[PDB]
Design a protein around this nucleic acid. Structure first.
Ligand SMILES: [Mg+2]
Ligand SMILES: [Mg+2]
Ligand SMILES: [Mg+2]
Ligand SMILES: [Mg+2]
Ligand SMILES: [Mg+2]
Ligand SMILES: [Mg+2]
Ligand SMILES: [Mg+2]
Ligand SMILES: [Mg+2]
Ligand SMILES: [Mg+2]
Ligand SMILES: [Mg+2]
Ligand SMILES: [Mg+2]
Ligand SMILES: [Mg+2]
Ligand SMILES: [Mg+2]
Ligand SMILES: [Mg+2]
Ligand SMILES: [Mg+2]
Ligand SMILES: [Mg+2]
Ligand SMILES: [Mg+2]
Ligand SMILES: [Mg+2]
Ligand SMILES: [Mg+2]
Ligand SMILES: [Mg+2]
Lengths: 54, 48, 69, 97, 252, 91
RNA sequence: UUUUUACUUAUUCAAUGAAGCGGGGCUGGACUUGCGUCCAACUUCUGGAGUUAAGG
RNA sequence: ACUCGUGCCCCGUGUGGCGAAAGGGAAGCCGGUUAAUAUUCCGGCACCUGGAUGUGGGUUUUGCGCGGCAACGCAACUGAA
RNA sequence: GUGAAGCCAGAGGAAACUCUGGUGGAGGCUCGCAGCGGUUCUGACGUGCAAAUCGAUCGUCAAAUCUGAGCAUGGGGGCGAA
């Protein structure tokens, strides 16, 4: 109940997922998301180039 | 009490430069063993 | 011919509701406001400790109705 | 292959390597890494990150079949090594294949 | 005479199973379109200990195919499953440990766990630590599958029944002696009010058929007919045979 | 030093419960309290938390194992058989 | 007349937030020679994200 | 959304009560005072919850702060489902 | 009080594993205070202090230990380490 009377900057830190994530987890999330999207793009281009070439 | 005294003396000697890290480590293991019965014994062993 | 139902659950449709419009009041005379001031304040307390705080603290002690707030 | 152990021993004896994730990333960034080895039990996220860095650096990647314990032992160390980079292959022909 | 303890147990009251520390029943996902036609991917968040159950449970999160929410299920953990593991449930799921597949898409000779007696029942068979159900054979024209149960029985279930590839975790729990009345007490204190157990021959005739007598003896054959009345079924009910088992048994 | 001839970890039970039962309990106790190398991170930091639950203190990964060992021989044999019988179906 | 096995609507069981059941036809294919049939519907490297539709 | 309550538009899988003066839980301390009450009265010095609208401050004017490599910091520094 | 695993050091030997100082702090372990109980005196009392108490002596005392409140089981029923 005490968190309702202190200001937001004291309740959070200034970055994505400021609260509830520790920063190392945020960095892991960023790197993982980027790598999965890259892999998805190259996989779709490979499937289009090698299974729909005819 | 004895272990705290011995480890404090070893840290002091390593910081001052009387002993290097290898001698410090072997002396630390000897002191974890029952080798040195008091600070005087440890000091005499170090000097020898 | 049938309307599209995007949810597989059926809800009772909302229908018009009307407020009561009785053709006779159930009671004819509304009661006068119970617990007026004459019933709330009964009599002042004039004991030793009651009179002491009249001077020491500028307060009056009364006996009032038990259900008055 | 089985010869990777002998090639690694020769590389460590003669050339020079860096052992560890941070130093491997530094080598990949600076562009002086000639080949990187990634242990089998390396975390998937770290392995993908190293693969992307090596794709950027045009650096070959060898997926070492052993664990980090086995990779460290092959490198002749008494500690584990999840990934490593070879900055200079000496008398060894590790970069030939 | 009195109502005996075995009869009293069915009333409930003090013999009801303990449930406070049990968080959720161990069940599969409801059989849906994704599991019927393809596969769905779930993530293992934790491996938890369920009081009163020897086997651990796995909390697995799935996405809702029809809503933005996410759904957490509670499976019986198969040994080898770990936190952060992707498991796949469906017809087209790969044949790896922890995946939930219909028995039709499973070859003969593999072991599974939490096998459904009928598709959609979310698991009934082989759900205890160290136990599993073997897929003996298939009958595709009949659309059925012969399986072997932990007890050794042979059963036939529709091929659409689901199971989790692997063996229930919890290993050889009964391999170590309890060694102590306190350890037996702790085992049963989260299950039921059934411990300790007083022998019937140590009672009085008012309390049990084995009753009293000037020596502690049953006094009549302990094998009891299958159709005996309630209150009579104390001892060996419908026993085909008695005594030490000195060889292989024809029945299985 | 040794401190004990044969009783080992089962010396906490004193003279009670019988020698055979003490040996049987010791057999499981040793493996259930032993430390194990993590399969994922390679550190010797996997320990038993509940009856069938083994967690790594370093990489924080939890896995379902046996009652008193991290892996049972039945599960290992089943994993090998599954790999073989799945590879003969795939290719 | 007696037995066996067929139907589903009586009746009984189970699941679900009662979402994708049954027929087809559009495509993708792979198998076959009086060009004829069967299968399938796009998610499996990664403890990320996925909602209040973009477009024609 | 209208002068005026009543015109509509979205979401829905849920849709009761009782049950703890030792479980959970918003917030008060000191000094003094009576024959008998006081963390309740008196004096001083505080806190919480809810509701209202002000002054200053901050931010912006096609827009919703700035700094630190970073861990994070700073008096705020929009934010429905 | 005793001193289980784990750990440190030093001695032997060839090995493998022997031994010796320490460290550690396990056990329905142990002596024992409170609590809980109730063995013996077949003590006191036995128209009592008491319709079960009093004294000494005893059992157990870190866990099948002791205990409050809320709640459940109701008479041929309940509950029962019986
Ligand atoms: Mg009766
Ligand atoms: Mg008994
Ligand atoms: Mg008796
Ligand atoms: Mg009888
Ligand atoms: Mg009889
Ligand atoms: Mg007898
Ligand atoms: Mg007789
Ligand atoms: Mg085509
Ligand atoms: Mg209430
Ligand atoms: Mg309270
Ligand atoms: Mg006040
Ligand atoms: Mg005041
Ligand atoms: Mg306010
Ligand atoms: Mg302003
Ligand atoms: Mg004891
Ligand atoms: Mg007493
Ligand atoms: Mg007497
Ligand atoms: Mg007398
Ligand atoms: Mg007495
Ligand atoms: Mg005397």
């Amino acid at each position: 109940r005490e968190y309702a009377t202190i200001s937001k900057p004291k309740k959070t830190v200034q970055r994505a997922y400021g609260g509830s994530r520790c920063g190392n987890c945020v960095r892991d999330r960023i790197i993982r998301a980027f790598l999965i999207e890259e892999q998805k793009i190259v996989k779709k281009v490979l499937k289009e180039q090698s299974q729909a070439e005819k | 009490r004895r272990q705290r005294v011995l480890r404090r003396l070893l840290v002091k000697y390593r910081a001052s430069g009387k002993i290097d890290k290898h001698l410090y480590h072997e002396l630390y293991h000897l002191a974890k063993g029952n080798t040195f019965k008091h600070k005087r014994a440890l000091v005499e062993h170090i000097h020898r | 011919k049938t309307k599209v139902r995007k949810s597989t659950t059926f809800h009772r449709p909302k229908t018009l509701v009307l407020s009561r419009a009785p053709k006779y009041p159930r009671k004819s005379i509304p009661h006068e406001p119970r617990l007026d001031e004459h019933k709330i304040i009964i009599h002042p307390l004039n004991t030793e400790g009651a009179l002491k705080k009249i001077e020491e603290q500028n307060t009056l002690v009364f006996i009032v109705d038990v259900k008055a707030n | 292959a089985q010869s990777i152990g002998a090639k690694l021993a020769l590389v460590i004896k003669s050339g020079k390597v860096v052992l560890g994730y941070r130093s491997t990333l530094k080598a990949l960034r600076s562009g002086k890494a000639k080949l990187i080895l990634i242990a089998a039990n390396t975390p998937p996220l770290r392995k993908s990150e190293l693969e992307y860095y090596s794709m950027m650096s045009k650096t070959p990647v060898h997926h070492y079949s052993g664990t980090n314990i086995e990779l460290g032992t092959a490198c002749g160390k008494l500690f584990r090594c999840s990934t490593m980079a070879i900055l200079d292959a000496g008398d060894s022909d590790i970069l030939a294949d | 005479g009195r109502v005996i303890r075995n009869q009293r147990k069915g009333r409930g009251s003090v013999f009801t199973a303990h449930t406070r520390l049990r968080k959720a029943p161990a069940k599969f996902r409801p059989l849906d379109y994704a599991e019927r036609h393809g596969y769905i991917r779930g993530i293992v968040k934790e491996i938890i200990h369920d009081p009163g159950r020897g086997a651990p449970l796995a909390r697995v999160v799935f996405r809702s195919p029809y809503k933005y929410k996410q759904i957490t299920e509670t499976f019986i953990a198969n040994e080898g499953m770990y936190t952060g593991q992707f498991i796949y449930a469906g017809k087209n799921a790969a044949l790896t440990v922890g995946n939930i597949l219909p028995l039709s898409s499973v070859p003969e000779g593999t072991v599974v766990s939490n096998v459904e007696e009928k598709p959609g029942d979310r698991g009934a068979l082989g759900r205890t630590s160290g136990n599993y159900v073997t897929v003996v054979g298939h009958n595709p024209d009949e659309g059925k599958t012969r399986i072997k149960l932990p007890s050794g029985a042979k059963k036939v279930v529709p091929s659409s029944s689901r199971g989790m590839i692997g063996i229930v975790a919890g290993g050889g729990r009964t391999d170590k002696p309890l060694l102590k009345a306190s350890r037996a007490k702790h085992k049963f204190a989260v299950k039921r009010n059934r411990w300790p157990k007083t022998r019937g021959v140590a009672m009085n005739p008012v309390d049990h058929p084995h009753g009293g007598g000037n020596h502690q003896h049953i006094g009549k054959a302990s094998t009891i007919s299958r159709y005996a009345a309630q209150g009579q079924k104390a001892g060996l009910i419908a026993a085909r045979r008695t005594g030490l088992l000195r060889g292989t048994q024809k029945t299985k | 030093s040794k401190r004990t001839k044969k009783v080992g970890i089962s010396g906490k039970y004193g003279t009670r419960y019988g020698a055979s039962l003490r040996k049987l309990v010791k057999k499981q106790e040793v493996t259930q309290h032993a430390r194990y190398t993590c399969t994922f991170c390679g550190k010797n930091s996997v320990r038993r938390t509940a009856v069938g639950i083994w967690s790594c203190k370093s990489c924080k990964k939890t896995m379902a194992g046996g009652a008193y060992t991290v892996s049972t021989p039945a599960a290992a044999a089943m994993r090998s058989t599954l790999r073989r019988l799945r590879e003969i179906t795939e290719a």
